[PDB]
Amino acid sequence: DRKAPVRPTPLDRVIPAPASVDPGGAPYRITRGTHIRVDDSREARRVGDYLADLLRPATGYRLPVTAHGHGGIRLRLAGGPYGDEGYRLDSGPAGVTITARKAAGLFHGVQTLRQLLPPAVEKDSAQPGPWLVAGGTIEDTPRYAWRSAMLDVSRHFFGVDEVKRYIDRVARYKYNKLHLHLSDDQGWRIAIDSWPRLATYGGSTEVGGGPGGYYTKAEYKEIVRYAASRHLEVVPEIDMPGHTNAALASYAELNCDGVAPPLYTGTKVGFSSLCVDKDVTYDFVDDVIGELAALTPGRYLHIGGDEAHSTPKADFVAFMKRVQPIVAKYGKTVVGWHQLAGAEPVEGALVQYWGLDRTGDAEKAEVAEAARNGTGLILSPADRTYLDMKYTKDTPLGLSWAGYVEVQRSYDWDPAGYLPGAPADAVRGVEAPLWTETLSDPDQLDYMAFPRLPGVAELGWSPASTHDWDTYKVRLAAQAPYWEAAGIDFYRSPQVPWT
């Protein structure tokens, strides 16, 4: 009876671990007549409809969403100590009420509610239930404001629907940002009107060759819209000056020698570089960032900056000196991989650290120094949160350059004191990147994303005081029947006592 537990799931048994859990009294039971009461606002109803859509299939209930009456499930916006993303969830025979200051908070409360319900809730056909919600109160707020998941659509392209699917996977764990690696050596995935070939030619293939793909502006806007409905702020990335072969292959004039390189379909890195010496390089960058900014309602613009190994340190610094301001010109906050820390980050910038344990002190120091100078830090250690890294030497997909990363290793650490000498207040959050050199379909993304994805979300959301592998693995283990019911393939780590 894994799919239909005899009794309700513990109120504290959710991922991320809630900031505060106070169980008590009897649970609430959703019955055929349960109404979803929301405030009389478009945003409030939006969350209500979202919730209704998640429950209707498995319950087979009407679950109407209205702005009147005393529905058994109440979503209400009101003042309180919950910030822009927190909420309170009260459960008892009198019903379930989720209170928050903003829609995002209600949305997060919903993500908790779906875990409080039984595994059968994931099914697409009417299930017996019962639809119980442990009784008590949960007061929940996030530790970090930057909790993202990155999807590489450059190595292997994933269409709009596949991205929507991944978005739903991450929305389950309260991630609030979706970083999209839109360009690299093997592909350019976003149409740029001023430079048409980037997409038509630069997006013509991918790793392994064959058809590639790219997002027309309409498709990209739909991805942003959908992400926004799941309260994910999209952070687009146009990697530069390295990892730029798709662009270079599309316009010969972008290459220092004026010759266009062949489209790249391999899985190596570091050989490409924009021409720091040419003026057209900066017109190109300005045009791209300008058009990308117009498609980005979010606050950030990621310019990459990683592995520009064919770019002399001096040219890299000069390049970043010149391009960073372009981001602000179009009203956005720049984000770059931590190599940017060695090229003078502008005010307000954030750098994403992707080093690992074996990374040298000098490199870590440069990043910690940037933090000291006001640069925000996003932590995504390659031997910690990279979803493309193999679990063990036997994992069929993924890479292993950063070693092997089992479930415990991915979860068992504290962002606050991870980087030596880095001020804890400089840590904006964490990110779980999923590179796709070896992944070409949605099922493979799931296998490499789960079960580590929930863990990184917890690191970004939960209080340090709730962090504990031995108790966390029990909560993680409880997800098995839900994932199985949802058709979400995942790695059955031997380190987890799967339910």
Ligand X SMILES: CC1=N[C@@H]2[C@@H](O)[C@H](O)[C@@H](CO)O[C@@H]2S1
What is the x/- site pattern for Cl ion, positions 224-263, by CB under 5 A? ----------------------------------------
Residue type, 331: G
Contact 345, 371 (CB under 8 A): no
Q: Which partner, ligand X, Cl ion, none, binds residue 143 by CB below 5 to 8 Å per kind? A: none
User: How many helices and strands (H and E) does the chain possess?
Assistant: 14, 19
CA-wise closest residue to 371 among 352, 399, 390, 397: 352
Q: Look up tokens 């009407």; give the residue.
A: 62
401 is in an annotated binding site: yes
Q: Which partner, Cl ion, ligand X, none, binds residue 189 by CB below 5 to 8 Å per kind? A: none
165 is in an annotated binding site: no
Q: Does 266 bind Cl ion (CB under 5 A)?
A: yes
Residue ranges in contact with ligand X by CB under 6 A: 243, 269, 306-307, 337, 354, 386, 388, 399, 435, 437
125: helix, coil or strand? coil
50 is in an annotated binding site: no
Q: Which partner, Cl ion, ligand X, none, binds residue 233 by CB below 5 to 8 Å per kind? A: none
Kindly name the residue from 307, 406, 431, 458 that is annotated as catalytic.
307
- Name the residue nearer to ligand X (CB basis): 111 or 410: 410
What is the x/- site pattern for Cl ion, positions 160-179, by CB under 5 A? --------xx----------
Tell me the C-alpha distance between 110 and 454, whole Å.
16
1 is in an annotated binding site: no
Contact 372, 340 (CB under 8 A): no
Residue type, 326: I
Question: CB 266 → Cl ion: shortest distance, Å?
Answer: 3
CA-wise closest residue to 59 among 157, 161, 130: 130
162 is in an annotated binding site: no
Tell me the C-alpha distance between 221 and 232, whole Å.
13
CA-wise closest residue to 237 among 174, 184, 177: 184
307 is catalytic: yes
Among 42, 70, 268, 393, binds Cl ion (CB under 5 A): 268
- Name the residue nearer to Cl ion (CB basis): 444 or 495: 444
- Per-residue tokens: 114: 């779906």
- Name the residue nearer to ligand X (CB basis): 435 or 461: 435
Residue type, 228: A
Q: What number of other Cβ atoms are within 10 A of residue 279's Cβ?
A: 8
Question: CB 448 → ligand X: shortest distance, Å?
Answer: 11
Question: CB 203 → Cl ion: shortest distance, Å?
Answer: 19
Residues at the site binding Cl ion, with contacts judged by CB under 5 A: 168-169, 266, 268-269
Give the residue numbers of the binding site for N-acetyl-D-glucosamine. Answer: 155, 306-307, 386, 388, 401, 437
Catalytic amino acids?
A: 307
